[model samples]
Target: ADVQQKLAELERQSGGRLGVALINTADNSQILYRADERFAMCXTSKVMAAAAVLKKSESEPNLLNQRVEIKKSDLVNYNPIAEKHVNGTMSLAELSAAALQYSDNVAMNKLIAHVGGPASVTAFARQLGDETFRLDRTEPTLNTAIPGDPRDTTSPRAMAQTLRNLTLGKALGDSQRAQLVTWMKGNTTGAASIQAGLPASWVVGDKTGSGGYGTTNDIAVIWPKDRAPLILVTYFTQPQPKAESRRDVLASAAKIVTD
Candidate 1:
């Protein structure tokens, strides 16, 4: 089998769902396996919230500097943010950084709520031209059994396209895009997924979502030394037994695009 076939079979072996998309910015070459299928976006949608707030920053003064507090009672799931919460107040910018870089559930909820819940995030995606993207829920619902028919999932193609737009500065200022890339670059969660798959020489700006029964994802912008950037989105909802590390599956997928 070719790399693409191998990828599809890998998903089948897991007896779970998978969605993926690969794009080469240098040329127009691309690949999509179950790309139209939807899976949980999880913390990955936190970036859209950040972008939405920054979009508002254009007209809303003091948006980033505004003090937002996280109450312990309002905690979503245990993370550094929750652990530190004793009714702590932080600038919106600070919370955004935590949500993106640390995948802090508490901080992410604050930002999503600050932006007027999931409706605004959906609006943001619409503004970005995502016909198939959805964001009807928030992070506090962490890793729970998805409600069968979810309204909070995104297709691999949609995520890849959204990340691509961020990289290209579309519907967003270059400066705002820079901050997102910076957060994703230093993101601590994806070390074993797509980030682990690529060679050290390649620079990856990525966001990861993990441990939701059968969901794990990595959406990234990869910059190869001599080649142009690539937008790779890999999403999985079941990759073998519950206890195994899906990172190995992701690393193999990355090599498919790189090699």
Candidate 2:
């Protein structure tokens, strides 16, 4: 009841589209704030891509350690200007780490290429039980092409299921799950969205998605020592006042979980 009231108050205060879902990772007990709505994924999709790469690496162990020379042409995604430093190269593992740690678009695009494009990633998602996971056409144009359709997409239920699969150790093997968690722990950006609402000192692993408009989304696994880890996915879009207002909505949602 307290949570429900808090959510209601947050909805009134933010006046923005909001959705949330939380599941105890240890046990199956769960809470559904708003788990079925869809929203844009932003860079959060990179998590799925990373999972696919890790799965593929199982069959080809050397692929993870294989160093590829990243040319200036390869850095065509988010930071074209950052391409000047690509004279040298790094391993696929290094690239994937950079993608998660810095939310590097070039690193993500390269990793996608390494995993054999979006089709492979999509297949991996399905294999992992995320039936709704699909790569839209946003990649080629927004990051690579000058003029691209920033078509926003995604569902809260799908995001929650993805996190749930991760927590349940169903998405990948135990070893691969550990690696995926490591990648998520390395995520430095969008910490405020999902982690902000949780208890202080609580460990939360998540990825955030933001866009030019009022777009903010976060998918996370909250690790509470005494309780099961909670899978939380929140997405907000088209804030009426401003972009920051959308974050305000996220913060409010966080408060609902923690308070």
Candidate 3:
């Protein structure tokens, strides 16, 4: 099947942009559409933060158990777990889980802080051999999704490659790598996105991101009933006033490629 053509048709129907990369990890085969184009990072970048924390934990080991003080000012809109602990502290592992599992805005900021800074996440990606994945801003600000600005953007190919490395590559130790995947599987979001397109028996662990200008993104590692895992990255953006984030677009794209 011509997956690229199908994805392009999807973009035309949605009246928006689509960037995708689907890799059959079994044979290292790939299908891509606008895979090199940049899209907003939004909360999707949290996965990188989680991996960064795990990488740090490899050396310090105690890094994940260390608790970081959370202040009232750290709280942000849409931060469910963070609001509860506004004046308290959360362990580094808790913060990572909150950011990856719940997409908690404040937890992302805390994780970014715990790993040195936002640049540290980018640096860590470089260490893992992902040169195109970049993160320079914290949440809410990173979610702005400006049309032409490149402050917080990542290409679908870069994100897919980075996700494969984090989840299946040698970037982290066995325990640390498993921990990251565990957080992804426990994620409370993306129910209607890629996950919606899979069969009942298939397994998936994914991270989602949303932003202004109709930006909605998901990066995942999926396991079919018996096939090897698939690494998929889907990013969508419609640069218009009050652009809507259409999760259905992602779901349909997933169906198109997986079929």
Any runs in candidate 1 off by more than 4 Å, and if so which?
145-148, 239-245
lDDT of 2 by residue, 8-103 (tens): 777767766677776655667556665665556777787888778888887786888897777767765465323645788778888777777677
TM-score of each: 0.92, 0.85, 0.97
Better of 1 and 3 by lDDT: 3
Model 2 CA lDDT for position 205: 77
Question: Residue 182: error of model 2 in Å?
Answer: 1.4
With candidate 1 superimposed using the best TM-score fit, by how many Å does residue 150's alpha carbon deviate from the native? Answer: 3.0
Model 3 CA lDDT for position 158 = 88
lDDT digits (tens) for residues 1-259 of candidate 1:
3877888777777666767799888787778888887777777787788888888887887888998766767676656855675667888888888888888887777877887888888888898897777778776664442525466788888888888887764777777777778888888788888977788888887888775565777888888899888999988776333533376677767877678
Would you list the clashing residue pairs of candidate 3? none
For candidate 2, the 10 contiguous residues with the lowest summed lDDT are 142-151
**Which residue segments of model 3 deviate by more than 4 Å?**
none
Off by over 4 Å in 2: 80-84, 138-152, 239-245
Query: Least lDDT summed over 10 consecutive residues: which range in candidate 3?
Result: 1-10
